[PDB]
Symmetry: D2
Subunit: 727 residues, 4 copies
């Protein structure tokens, strides 16, 4: 054979390249020199292919992989065709149960390093020295949809980090919002069943916009705080690179002296916070259901590594009851104004997997996977999670040996007396399979707890009370956090929350559920409640207008760290611009455009009405990446239209729509020279409008303005103007 | 408790209603008077709910389904909470492997009746008498995407019918185009791997628009005929009600005299043939990924029963 | 803690040691220098234990592995004890489904090597050069019984060999009799259900002595041939080392020129053929249900490696129809008088596994696993077997990646486009998961058939006929092979066959089934039917007495290769002798005894009425291996009683019974000096009798005479004399 | 979950309770019970919260654990009284 093209264009270069410049590839082929201890330890199971013969799984070379064995060339297939049966058998059993929740996820390899030793507050080995590099495997996910569902749905996102430390696997299994919907793990199946596709007909996928979800919410006010986050633009992240991560629960740090410190874990995106707007997110689920998974993979392949800063909110044990909320209540956040996040270290995701199924699908994360130096608390949600993540992998990953699946293997030593189980890989030579034993001189042996390399000993927390199935009265407060969140948002973020509730409740068929939810919103904030009510054609009663607002949280009337955009934190590196070409582009504009984008690490996609190439005024041949319909504005952060022969595209409906869609979704638009004739399609005044860059040509001034708009992410002041655009 | 509204507006009318008029409901509650032999035989495993106490799977009534058992109301959860562990255990193991192919599908119960005895050409009992009615269960599906993928993608569609005949189950497992992509079953894993999400990153979902699919097609010209059908508006049906169904293969009909007749199976949509246009189909995957599932469910709820010849 | 004894006597020496001298141990610890390519390839998964810390499966050191985490030291166990839950979870899911048949089995590692190149008749790489060593993993088994059933039952034995060749795994999955019970694989479930424990009450275990088996046999005369073999002493082998092995089916050898030769596979035991007697075998299932497993393991630990010679019955394609029986009928053997077994090579089993579950329980053998140079035939039993062995490990071993379980892995290259599946270990980096592909230049690629390293291509056998569910008329002959077997047995073998049938039929509760089996026996041989009938109180009718015997098999009225014992093939190495001690043994007799035995590789076990030590006449301290009741005569091949203070054990009932049992089971007995007082216990005449060695001392020819008797295995001439004897 | 293949082992004939059993648990391998409840969660209004919790009482009441007093630190320790 020789099916590859003689020019070698079928294989992507093994060097960092921008989105769309090369075909994507398995991580070890794309970036073979990106290494970490975990990735290196996976080399025993990595399989190549070039120059090898095609074989059965038993190693028999296959001569004809195109036909079944039959009696005569038009005869019946013979039972003795073991090659065919092995191949079909393996195919017939490829799928494993998807995760109960968070089935849809995207993962990458990376590393973490602390900024300083935290030995004064924790004996966790991975936080003991800034030179200790811990390999990580991170999986970002949605919650509700199946593995085949869409990425840009409105949902909570999961953010799970597996740290392969020298003293054990530590999984920090968090979400992108600082609280959860419910307080006690006993109600997880209830909440999850309510949000998931309804049982009769299994609709809807990846959406909380249906009766059972809002039925549950309306009857369980503890849910409103996370519901507020989900309804805000936090529910629709621009990318996994631009969202926050939280462990949610209060855990404990344990130092060498044995002092316990309460801690809440945070991940701060170094690319900043950014979200889409609902119409863009929903339409993007149809135009590219794999948008976040693709964005993550391509960012890594381009060298735009996803970077996060691990942060700790630290609370002394004696401060346990000093807030007006319970620290163990997972529906309550700890405002950063009250307890600041201490910056602890940084995690860089720099390599995609080789095989999605083997490494991402089969990865198993569990919050119970902690190491000496960390400990749990009585948070009743966390407590019940401890049982679930070990239990669920017995069916999902087929047995109790799921830690032998390559991606799950610890990189540190593991030895115990556990034996057998389905697909047992490890062959134990210990004469003994029990302890205490004399026949192997009691090895492997227990290790007393100690400052470093000691065995795990639980913090000796005092437990006093009767065996009861009872919620703590301290958790019975449901509206003050939701109010705090609401008052901390900008006016446009508030507007998007009202629109989120309004859209979702409009899809709830039983009107009484909508009314009951509006009543709950009246206990949070009257303006919010009235705005949503008016969109549902509902009138607040007399009594609802007089509900006294909940108290502020420890004197706070707001906390800007809860808003996505209140405090500027934009980063344009890794963003993308759509450039709309014409058949005789003013080469001077493209040169200036592309040079400036490349200096800020902003990528570009050259679009036209057909594939192939167009030739600029000076003769520069410009390769087209996609058509206007092929790569809609939903996929880019901004749109630039260079001058040239505008008449080529002035009547192109698709070109005009590209600008109207981007305009509607608050994206920066820049128009050079005769490209200013497109101002009429988006009805911009002669004197311009903030958010629209316009100039005789695309010089350096035009590009700085556009890049300034991109750092601000979206043009929020345009909101009142999109109402009148048919798009 | 007093949770349902006093006006009873939480319960959908148990009579045929047009799309959007009432919340949808489980079939036996929505249309209690519809029956067939198969639906009646499922009655022994149907479980109600109204007026029963909430129990464990072992039949123990539960007093508090809102909390775990802990040592103190702010204490650690106890290992002896068997009610919590059973409930979470069941939850933890709810998923089963999805189908390798055709994972995305929507189904409904129905019935079949032949127009005339076909005993001159086949001894199949379900075609032996115009009065003999055979319960069916039909599942329509896409091919490539997962069970959580979108309905209005461009793909071939599966049309599988389970006939509960008096002489055994007869499954007629066809698609909505008369041919398949490949000639020999040995290449099925090759073809399916090429159309499915590429192995490094598991993209794209529910789409043949990616390199490996076209790579395979370009090297295996036998695939062109079904690709022609997929690229046409046949690949984006308006509804499962407005598409044709085919068994694809030539099978045989055997009469009582032992004579064989070659046969290709067809399903004609009595609602006619109708497809979307690509831009609409693709946008619809985003606006309502469950559109075909919903449309089938609602047609039946309205009395617009899908009919096929 | 440091629980081992300071003298290091908890650990067995890593040198060959006789049975019982040291605690047995994992193969890689007992014989670390015994290596092969497969054993070396397993090093990536072998796990040690010494000097390692006890951890969870996630690598977290455990401080206290004696207690659960509770609230108070007398309090409730807490759900947060993840260490307890991981440990109990792994325990709770240790078991996997046992094999449907052959669930009881014992295995070992070894190596094979051909005597000469067989390139003229086969292109199989493992048979191409005398210097090519192929690692093997062999599993011997019973058939009916579960994995916890007893070894010495009356049943067929399985003999499966996994050859790890350079061109793929070849599994030769055979039994210890040259035919099977049934002709078509479609009846496998019927036959197996008939022999296994009856469905209402799941009785009996490890036995065909029950109504459903004999009901089936009575209605399916094709079974009679293998039933004759099971009722003979073949059904109760002395050890897996002393039984023959057969592939049963006619397969094909294919050479480089494309010529097909029919072949039947044989394994000849280099230790010779030897079986127990029924009473001994049955009682031994009680005294030591693990006798064969133990014996295999200890033989290998002692350096008595089980050795077998692979041999081929070869039949040219032109001679397919030259016999009275069909070559494709698995109920028919090919008499060695017609087609000799040509010696092909030797297999040596020289290392036990490390972990029984991991290597033995999870091993998967399948007769469809063939390599270029071999092919199948249309034998209808073999044809259906090809479906079953791949299918069954989807549940037994949890999925289609069972070839990734360490013991099953090929040692040669394996690459293909198969992906995913539960417990997937291999991480594929191939950009493509399909062929034909251009994106990886079509690798891995198909390989044309050729003389060496070529792809597999089935032999182009002509197929002609209609699609039918029909037994070939050439298979409808059921009594001549049974008769040929019967007539080839010695007179004491025939008696044992008659006793086997009589005992088994006596456990059949429904008398008409016994009558029906007797009628079938009357179609094989009248002497046989009459003797069985007589033992069942049944009279043959005049018609039965006149049934004409079946024709000879191609002119043969007997074939001595079918007898275990007709042609002497004795081998004493690895056998064991019980030595009954007294409290003042004549040390001189003991020295002569033990050294003679050791010179022939015969083991000894010193027995007494208690454990500890006894002191000989000269002060020699004699370590006691076991008590008379603790290691019954069933477990040894011969018994020797040295002189000394015989009055010590003269009135010991166990010591007297030891000799009565050994006497009844036809084993050699040797009495020195005053030990001759025991002759009265077994009723031996003053003058002596063949089979009893006696002299004033253990000097001169005493040991040579006993070793001659051991070389003949059992004293068959004593049968008439044991008839009485209350033992 | 491994021995009997899943969480629906209570639906294996010999294991089934002969008294009523109703809850919001769904699916799992070899699910036999076909639930008609519009709701698969509680609290729910769409099925008027059925099946419902039952207060503990003298007969036919919901299960409530004896309210044993628990007092101690979180320890992996054998009681001295067991020694
Ligand atoms: C008691 C059950 C329970 C509860 C209360 C929660 N979860 Fe959970 N979650 C599970 C039961 C579970 C699970 C059934 O065990 C899952 C799905 C399958 C699996 O491996 O883990 C899981 C998956 C899962 C994932 C995906 C890990 C991956 O990518 O594989 C994340 C990120 C979280 N969860 C995060 C959360 C957060 C931060 C929670 C609340 C604070 C939460 N879970 C409460
Ligand atoms: C050799 C394997 C093979 C081949 C060549 C095909 N299929 Fe298939 N199909 C499968 C192996 C498979 C499967 C692995 O066995 C599936 C998926 C899971 C299931 O139960 O069956 C299945 C599912 C599946 C379904 C969904 C049944 C349901 O709704 O559950 C339909 C409609 C088809 N097939 C249609 C066909 C047609 C018309 C085919 C070509 C003529 C075809 N398949 C070729
Ligand atoms: C069609 C079904 C079928 C038939 C006709 C045969 N058996 Fe088989 N046997 C199986 C189906 C099977 C099996 C269900 O697939 C097993 C049990 C589990 C396993 O892995 O393979 C197996 C086990 C198995 C083993 C055990 C391998 C081990 O140690 O793991 C041996 C030695 C044999 N068989 C030998 C034979 C011989 C020589 C046969 C007749 C010539 C025969 N079997 C007929």
């Amino acid at each position: 054979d020789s099916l590859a093209p003689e020019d070698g264009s079928h294989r992507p270069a093994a060097e960092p390249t921008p989105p769309g410049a090369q075909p994507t590839a398995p991580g070890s082929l794309k970036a073979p020199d990106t290494r970490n201890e975990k990735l290196n330890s996976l080399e025993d199971v990595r399989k190549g292919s070039e120059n090898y013969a095609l074989t059965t799984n038993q190693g028999v070379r296959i001569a004809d992989d195109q036909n079944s064995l039959r009696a005569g060339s038009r005869g019946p297939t013979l039972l003795e065709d073991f090659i065919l049966r092995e191949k079909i058998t393996h195919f017939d059993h490829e799928r494993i149960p998807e995760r109960i929740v968070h089935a849809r996820g995207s993962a990458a390899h990376g590393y973490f390093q602390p900024y300083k030793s935290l030995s004064d507050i924790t004996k966790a080995d991975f936080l003991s020295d800034p030179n200790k590099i811990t390999p990580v495997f991170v999986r970002f996910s949605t919650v509700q949809g199946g593995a085949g569902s869409a990425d840009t749905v409105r949902d909570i996102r999961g953010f799970a980090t597996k740290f392969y430390t020298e003293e054990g696997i530590f999984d920090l299994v968090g979400n992108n919002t600082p609280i959860f919907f419910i307080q006690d793990a006993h109600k997880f199946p209830d909440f999850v069943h309510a949000v998931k596709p309804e049982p009769h007909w299994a609709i809807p996928q990846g959406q909380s916009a249906h009766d059972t979800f809002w039925d549950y919410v309306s009857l369980q006010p503890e849910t409103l705080h996370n519901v507020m986050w989900a309804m805000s633009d936090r529910g629709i992240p621009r990318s996994y690179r631009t969202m926050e991560g939280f462990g949610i629960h209060t855990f404990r740090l344990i130092n060498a002296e044995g002092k316990a410190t309460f801690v809440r874990f945070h991940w701060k995106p170094l690319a900043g916070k950014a979200s889409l707007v609902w119409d863009e997110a929903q339409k993007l689920t149809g135009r590219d259901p794999d948008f976040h998974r693709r964005e993550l993979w391509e960012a890594i392949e381009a060298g735009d590594f996803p970077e996060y800063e691990l942060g700790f909110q630290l609370i002394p044990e004696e401060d346990e009851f000093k807030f007006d909320f319970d620290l163990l209540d997972p529906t309550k956040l700890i405002p950063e104004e009250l307890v600041p996040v201490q910056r602890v270290g940084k995690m860089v995701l720099n390599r995609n997997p080789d095989n999605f199924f083997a490494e991402n699908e089969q990865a198993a994360f569990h919050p119970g996977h902690i190491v000496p130096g960390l400990d749990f608390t009585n948070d009743p949600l966390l407590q019940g999670r401890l049982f679930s993540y070990t239990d669920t992998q017995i069916s999902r990953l087929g047995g109790p040996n799921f830690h032998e699946i390559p991606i799950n293997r610890p990189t540190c030593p593991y030895h115990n007396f556990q034996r057998d189980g389905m697909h047992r890989m490890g062959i134990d030579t210990n004469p003994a399979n029990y302890e205490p034993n004399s026949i192997n001189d009691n090895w492997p042996r227990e290790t007393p707890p100690g400052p470093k390399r000691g065995g795990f000993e639980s913090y000796q927390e005092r437990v006093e009370g009767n065996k009861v199935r009872e919620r703590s009265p301290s958790f019975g407060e449901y509206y003050s956090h939701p109010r705090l969140f609401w008052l901390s948002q900008t006016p446009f973020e508030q507007r998007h929350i009202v629109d989120g509730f309004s859209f979702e409740l409009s899809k709830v068929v039983r009107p009484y559920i909508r009314e009951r939810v509006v009543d709950q919103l009246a206990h949070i904030d009257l303006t919010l409640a009235q705005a949503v009510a008016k969109n549902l054609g509902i009138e607040l009663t007399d009594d609802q207008l007089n509900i006294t607002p909940p108290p502020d949280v420890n004197g706070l009337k707001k906390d800007p760290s809860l808003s996505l955009y209140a405090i500027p934190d934009g980063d344009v590196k890794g963003r993308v611009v759509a450039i709309l070409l014409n058949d005789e582009v003013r080469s001077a504009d493209l040169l200036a455009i592309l040079k400036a984008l490349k200096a800020k690490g902003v990528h570009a996609k050259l679009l036209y009405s057909r594939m192939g190439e167009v030739t600029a005024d000076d003769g520069t041949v410009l390769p087209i990446a996609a058509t206007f319909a092929g790569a809609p504005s939903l996929t880019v952060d901004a749109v630039i239209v260079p001058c040239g022969n505008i008449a080529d595209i002035a009547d192109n409906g698709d070109a005009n729509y590209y600008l109207m869609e981007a305009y509607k979704h608050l994206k920066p638009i820049a128009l050079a020279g005769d490209a200013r004739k497109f101002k009429a399609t988006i009805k911009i005044a002669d004197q311009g409008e903030e958010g629209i860059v316009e100039a005789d040509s695309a010089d350096g001034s035009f590009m700085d303005e556009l890049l300034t708009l991109m750092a601000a992410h979206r043009v929020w002041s345009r909101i009142p103007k999109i109402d009148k655009i048919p798009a």
